[PDB]
Design a protein around this nucleic acid. Structure first.
Ligand SMILES: [Mg+2]
Ligand SMILES: [Zn+2]
Lengths: 104, 468, 225, 52, 136
RNA sequence: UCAUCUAGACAGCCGGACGGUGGCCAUGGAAGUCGGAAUCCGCUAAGGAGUGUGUAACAACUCACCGGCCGAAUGAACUAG
RNA sequence: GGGCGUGUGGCGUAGUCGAGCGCGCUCCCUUGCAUGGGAGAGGUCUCCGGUUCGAUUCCGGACUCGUCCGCCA
């Protein structure tokens, strides 16, 4: 849900037809003034590919940086990361089928 | 027509300058009018005016302001147009406009707000708290052209009553202070001006001009309100502590010493109030910066910095009195800085420079800051020699020489030594004799009324006739 | 203010306009923004005259102006001369110049007190300048640039000169004119500063492509704050 | 932004059409054949390409 | 002319066809300009594209400094020497053909112009009028 | 050549379009609708272990089926003048 | 214009889908009519896509080079 709040915030700033660098400066100023929604964001924004990046706590003090598409839901981005996981497994099985004949 | 939501702003809940529920701020990125309010405006014409004001290009902004003014001028037909919604939106945009580089934008915006106050009197009461501080900041802007018209209009708005103008300073003083704090502490050069469209310099220049206005306002606020220090001490401390006001005291670079002068006035005013004595840290920070400024003056910039020098010395003399020359004690190398400053300063003399130097001497003599014979006299003698060679080429020459003599004569009196007496006589003779046309300038001769006993001067005239 | 203005796209305002303390001259074929800049900034105290000199839209390079007097070339017609006589105040004197170089804005760089001219002007024209303008005259070149009007912008407070100017020439000209001079550029690096902009005691008007450091140099040297 | 209902009303006439693949004619959205003679009233139609 | 024109120009009698060599009036170190093209000229069978006063041309430096030779550059005609009529009906002409060097936007490569220039050229190009000594 | 048809057909409106059951595998999830197989009953006038939209999965909407109005022919595929 | 083939380290050159040698010179050792020896550096295998598990290697396209054939009275 908090990722959806961050997305709604960035999309509301986008829908004002505001300049991207002014949006990044607004994120920096609100991070300095201690807004949580701003402080969850990482500043090199990929608005050219409609993608933001967000910091999530690994343990419920280390934070991980995850890229979120603005045109899909947060659950839909999670399903994309699951899909990239699932495609990686099939290539690994193809490698395991390769190993014996290749090394022979 | 207008789309989007300022979701980030809702969380912050800081209205900056504004007290009516809309954030009003100088920085370009935020404080922009919310899209929903913009749609709520009464007429389409007004909405278009707002979009144009938002656009960066100046010709477009100016055209929109001209249109808005025309609408306000025809107030009777358009009274419905200007509502609370218009005023809330205007207040947010006005703040950005007053910091604009272009003077016309600044002037027009100020004129427009004043017109609104006159026309909508008693209905802008809710918004007076937001508008009045900004209007005043404009009236205390270094440029004469923006300030003078704005003040005249304000006076006219209040029916030419001096009391009302003074009252305004008293009534919104807390708010006026908040504006100053925001410029000095909250803002930075980058926040005020966009980096992409401006250089490292210029951005600095702009910030400095805006901050100077804030300081001028602060000085005015202090003069107008006697009790300001006591009521707003916490706010005052934060503004004063920040180095931004003090960074203005740099003479190495910068177009004018006018901003630097404004800071000097503030330090003096604070000392008169006793705030500087009361708070030691603020005073020490200010003093050290002032000492650094003395080093900045150099041969290359001496012509540029000459008007400000009499003022600098005068402030130093007043500060020295505090704490028995405590100000010199703060810096280990202060004496060296002063000596260097004096050496650079003597080469170019500006009106009133000598009086300042004597004042410094008067404060320092009790505590022996400068050796009278080993250190001070050399300074005096060299000075007269310099004055004579470029003499009276200059205009104030007559006034400048007169000053030297009056001051030197006083300095000499506190010697009780032969060398000083000898120097005075010899120098006087040289100054009159090589001269230029000292007698010819009657004023110069009058101002320099005499330097010695009357009968002896006659004996010397006798020698000139007796000479080969 | 150094006011950003174009003449229909042209960033050279000194070519199409002549600004003094007492009056202003603008070309007849001008845009609404170009007229509105002078009308807003100058106000109603100072007359603005829409004029044509010798049948040409260029008026700043054709004429040399002062608060006491105005100089016009020989090719200026009687209708234009009478219109300038009616539109201008009674204080200024308008006198035709009969001289071969004939482009007085290029030839003459002048202010209220002191003037720089082309070295090769005629002595009658020099005496005519000294009579009508009441201005002391020096024949000098700015680092070998004979067109001192095109290559210098001058006012009472200060002056802007050509960027590629020798420093020795800078203190020589500064001592000769009794004003401080700065070498600088206008209109995104254009060398012709006098053709680039017009200035007086309280106003400077320049092209839109004049950058912010250049505008800061302008307001610093002309003390417009 | 126009308005959502007003964008719907304008897109009813400007965007919710079909295009004949042979002669590029702008056609009713529920049409089955092109109304033009030059393509021979063909039934090769496609939806008009939307944005987004 | 074309792009850098400040206004329009009345028709001046064309005096400089392709292949004409004119004097190089400015101080850029070039001695003559050789006209190879006229900007804005029309198309007719066998007709040479000709230039008049105030026109922008494409030219090569045939004689001058070697860093200016052997390349094409824009030029502006400032003296025509073929007599043309104004709308006040005087027929006038200079005694030589002369032009200056410029970029495609029209600002001069040089800095000063020797000799007279025409007012029909000075009105149309402001940089030429800026660096021009005398305008007739 | 197949089908439907005064025991009410095809268009157009309006209403329902349900339970066992989130049927079995498989997935971090997939409940009619990512797929693999099966694809059966009840209540019925009638409703697919689903025609699409559809959500992370739901939820929701619509279908092909049955009903009121209409009262009479109509739908699909193909052939050749 | 078209066809056919070609492209490897600073240079030349070997490549079956699983980049070596020689020459230039980096260092060290070694000595007239100046050698030899030993460890070195050196590639986006012309480039871009697909196949494979991995392409110098297979395929498609582009660039480049080298050959061959081409107008009229
Ligand atoms: Mg031919
Ligand atoms: Zn068709």
């Amino acid at each position: 849900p908090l990722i959806e709040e961050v997305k709604l915030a960035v999309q509301g700033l986008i829908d004002q037809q505001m300049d991207w660098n002014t949006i990044e400066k607004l994120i920096k100023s609100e991070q300095k003034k201690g807004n949580r929604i701003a402080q969850l964001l990482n500043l090199p924004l990929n608005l050219k590919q409609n993608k933001i990046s967000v910091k999530l706590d690994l343990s419920s003090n280390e934070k991980i940086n995850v890229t979120i598409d603005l045109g899909l839901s947060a659950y839909a981005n999670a399903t994309e990361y699951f899909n990239i996981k699932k495609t990686s497994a099939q290539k690994q099985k193809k490698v395991e089928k390769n190993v014996g004949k290749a090394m022979k | 027509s207008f789309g989007g939501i300022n979701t980030f702003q809702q969380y912050n809940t800081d209205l900056g300058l504004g007290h009516n529920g809309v954030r009003i701020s100088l920085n370009y990125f935020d404080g922009l009018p919310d899209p929903s309010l913009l749609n709520s405006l009464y007429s389409n014409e007004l909405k278009l005016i707002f979009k144009s004001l938002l656009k960066r290009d100046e010709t477009t902004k100016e055209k929109a302001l001209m249109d808005l003014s025309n609408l306000i001028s025809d107030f009777n037909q358009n009274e419905y147009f200007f509502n609370d919604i218009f005023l809330l939106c205007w207040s947010q945009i006005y703040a950005k406009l007053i910091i604009s580089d272009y003077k016309v934008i600044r002037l027009q915006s100020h004129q427009i707000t004043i017109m609104l106050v006159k026309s909508l009197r008693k209905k802008i009461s809710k918004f007076l708290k937001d508008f009045i501080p900004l209007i005043l900041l404009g009236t205390c802007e270094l440029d004469y052209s923006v300030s003078k018209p704005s003040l005249n209009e304000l006076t006219e708005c209040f029916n030419k009553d001096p009391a009302k103008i003074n009252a305004l300073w008293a009534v919104f003083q807390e708010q006026l202070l908040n504006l100053v704090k925001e410029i000095v502490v909250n803002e930075n050069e980058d926040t005020i001006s966009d980096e992409r469209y401006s250089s490292k310099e210029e951005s600095e220049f702009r910030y400095h001009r805006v901050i100077a206005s804030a300081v001028l306002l602060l000085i005015k606020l202090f003069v107008h309100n006697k009790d300001v220090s006591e009521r707003n001490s916490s706010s005052l401390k934060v503004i004063l502590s920040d180095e931004s006001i003090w960074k203005l005291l740099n003479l190495k670079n910068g177009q004018n010493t006018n901003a630097y002068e404004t800071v000097l006035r503030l330090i003096d005013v604070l000392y008169t109030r006793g705030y500087m004595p009361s708070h030691k840290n603020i005073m020490k920070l200010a003093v050290k910066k002032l000492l650094k400024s003395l080093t900045h003056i150099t041969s290359k910039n001496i012509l540029k910095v000459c008007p400000v020098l009499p003022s600098i010395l005068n402030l130093l003399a007043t500060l020295d009195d505090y704490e028995d020359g405590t100000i010199w004690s703060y810096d280990k190398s202060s004496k060296e800085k002063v000596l260097k400053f004096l050496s650079v300063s003597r080469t170019s003399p500006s009106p009133g420079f000598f009086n300042a130097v004597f004042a410094l001497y008067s404060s320092t003599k009790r505590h022996s800051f400068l050796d009278y014979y080993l250190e001070w006299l050399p300074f005096w003698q060299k000075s007269v020699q310099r004055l004579n060679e470029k003499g009276f080429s200059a205009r104030n020459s007559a006034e400048v020489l007169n000053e030297f003599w009056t001051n030197f004569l006083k300095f000499a009196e506190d010697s009780s030594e032969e060398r000083v007496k000898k120097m005075v006589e010899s120098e006087i003779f040289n100054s009159l004799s090589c001269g230029k046309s000292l007698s010819e300038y009657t004023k110069l001769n009058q101002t320099l009324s005499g330097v010695f006993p009357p009968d002896k001067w006659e004996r010397e005239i006798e020698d000139y006739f007796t000479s080969d | 203010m150094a006011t950003r203005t174009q003449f229909e796209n042209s960033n050279e305002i000194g070519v199409f306009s002549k600004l003094t303390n007492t009056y202003c001259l603008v070309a007849v074929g001008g845009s609404e923004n170009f007229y509105s800049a002078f009308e807003a900034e100058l106000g109603d105290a100072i007359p603005i005259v829409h004029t044509t000199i010798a049948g040409t839209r260029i008026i700043g390079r054709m004429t040399a102006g002062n608060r006491r007097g105005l100089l016009v070339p020989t090719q200026t017609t009687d209708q234009e001369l009478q219109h300038l006589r009616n539109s201008l105040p009674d204080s200024v004197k308008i006198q035709r110049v009969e001289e071969r170089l004939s482009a007085l804005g290029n030839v003459i760089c002048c202010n209220d007190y002191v003037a720089l001219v082309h070295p090769d002007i005629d002595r009658e024209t020099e005496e005519l300048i000294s009579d009508v303008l009441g201005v002391e005259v020096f024949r000098q070149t700015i680092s070998g640039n004979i067109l001192v009007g095109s290559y210098c912008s001058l006012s009472n407070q200060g002056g802007l000169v050509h960027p590629q100017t020798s420093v020795q020439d800078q203190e020589e000209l500064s001592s000769l004119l009794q004003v401080p001079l700065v070498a600088g550029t206008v209109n995104r690096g254009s060398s012709v500063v006098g053709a680039g902009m017009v200035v007086n005691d309280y106003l400077a008007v320049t092209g839109l492509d004049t950058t912010a450091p250049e505008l800061s140099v302008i307001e610093s040297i002309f003390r417009l704050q | 932004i126009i308005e959502p209902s007003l964008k719907a009303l304008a897109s009813k006439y400007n965007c919710d059409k079909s295009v004949c693949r042979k002669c590029y004619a702008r056609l009713p959205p529920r049409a089955t054949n092109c109304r033009k003679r030059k393509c021979g009233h063909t039934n090769q139609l496609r939806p008009k390409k939307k944005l987004k | 002319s074309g792009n850098g024109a400040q206004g329009t120009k009345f028709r001046i009698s064309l005096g400089l066809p392709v292949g004409a060599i004119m004097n190089c009036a400015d101080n850029s170190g070039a001695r003559n300009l050789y006209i190879i093209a006229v900007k804005g000229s029309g198309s007719r069978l066998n007709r040479l594209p000709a230039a008049s006063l105030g026109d922008m041309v494409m030219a090569t430096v045939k004689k001058g400094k070697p860093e200016l030779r052997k390349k094409v550059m824009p030029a502006i005609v400032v003296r025509q020497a073929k007599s043309w009529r104004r709308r006040d009906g005087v027929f006038l002409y200079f005694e030589d053909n002369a032009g200056v060097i410029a970029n495609p936007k029209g600002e001069m490569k040089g800095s000063a112009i020797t000799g007279p220039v025409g007012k029909e050229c000075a009105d149309l190009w402001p940089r030429v009028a800026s660096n021009s000594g005398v305008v007739v």
